[PDB]
Amino acid sequence: DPDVLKVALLPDENASELIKRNQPLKDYLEEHLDKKVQLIVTTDYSSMIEAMRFGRIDLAYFGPLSYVMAKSKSDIEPFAAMVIDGKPTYRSVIIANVASGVNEYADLKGKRMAYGDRASTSSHLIPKTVLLETADLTGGQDYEQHFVGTHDAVAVNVANGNADAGGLSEVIFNHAAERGLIDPSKVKVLGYSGEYPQYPWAMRSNLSPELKTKVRDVFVGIDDPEVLRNFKAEAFAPITDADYDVIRNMGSLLGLDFA
């Protein structure tokens, strides 16, 4: 068991700043754990992942895709994840242009599909998975696929008729009309993806169970906005490794290499 907990944050080029910025986390953790903390910020994901693998980071904060890579190479466990919009998970919604006569995923056969950014989960990878798993529809092959830039652009492109359907974040679609981006009488929801996970905090499994248990309780109980605002989080809530299978499965289905 390390005398001082090595708590790594997201990788960053300005390590001194991000460490200073997150002093409220250091102070919150020392007081609540009764243990000294050393904050760590790595130049890239490979450094972080390998340093944890070899016992030189104790707790670490990852992106979900990054977490899945870290887990394949080392005995770690997630114990909390970022809460935003009331939970540590989110969905994608598929919407359809009302006038296009698309009533079901299957009807996207030979139609136009709007996606956000090639790299987005909520506006590309997730909605693409849904179409494949549910209707055996492959992008490029069984429908025409347009990448239009952002989540707002998906909603707009579907609503104004330039696509028949599109996939975006549930959360963002839910205020697209509120913000006046679209007429809500021109689109309807076809359905939702499963729940995908947010940024996990993860720890090395061979820390003592006394420490591990206490770590998890402390992080889950953080209510200090000065700590939380740096993660753009309302809270941290329990999460487990099993909550990232839906990402593993998405990798496979689409043939993604996370590096």
Residue numbers in the entry: 5 to 263
Paper text:
Here we elucidate the molecular basis of high-affinity phosphite and hypophosphite acquisition by determining the ligand-binding affinity and structure of the PBPs of phosphite and hypophosphite ABC transporters from environmental microorganisms. The structures reveal that ligand specificity, measured here by thermophoresis, arises from a combination of steric considerations and the interaction between a ligand P-H hydrogen atom and an aromatic π system in the binding pocket.
In our study, numerous attempts to crystallise apo forms of Te_PtxB and Pm_PhnD were unsuccessful, but a 2.1 Å resolution structure of Pseudomonas stutuzi PtxB (Ps_PtxB) in an open conformation was determined. Analysis of the conformational change between the open and closed, phosphite-bound structure of Ps_PtxB using DynDom42 revealed that domain closure is induced by a ~60° rotation around an axis that lies between the two lobes. This is facilitated by flexible loops that form the hinge region between the lobes (residues A85-T93 and Y200-Q202), as well as residues from the extreme end of the C-terminal helix (G255-L258). Y94 resides on the hinge region, the conformation of which alters substantially during domain closure, whilst D16 sits on a flexible loop that latches over the binding pocket in the closed conformation.
